[PDB]
Amino acid sequence: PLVVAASIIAILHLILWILDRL
Numbered sequence: 001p002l003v004v005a006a007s008i009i010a011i012l013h014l015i016l017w018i019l020d021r022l
Ligand SMILES: CCCCCCCCO[C@@H]1O[C@H](CO)[C@@H](O)[C@H](O)[C@H]1O
Pocket: 001, 002, 003
């Protein structure tokens, strides 16, 4: 579960970063 949690957090932060950049 910690892997799943950390990976989801990271991926969502990356999506938001891309959205904010474009
Ligand atoms: C300090 C208290 C720790 C509690 C941890 C509870 C969840 C543990 O979860 C375990 O994580 C492991 C490592 O990713 C996996 O290999 C196991 O399959 C999974 O059951």
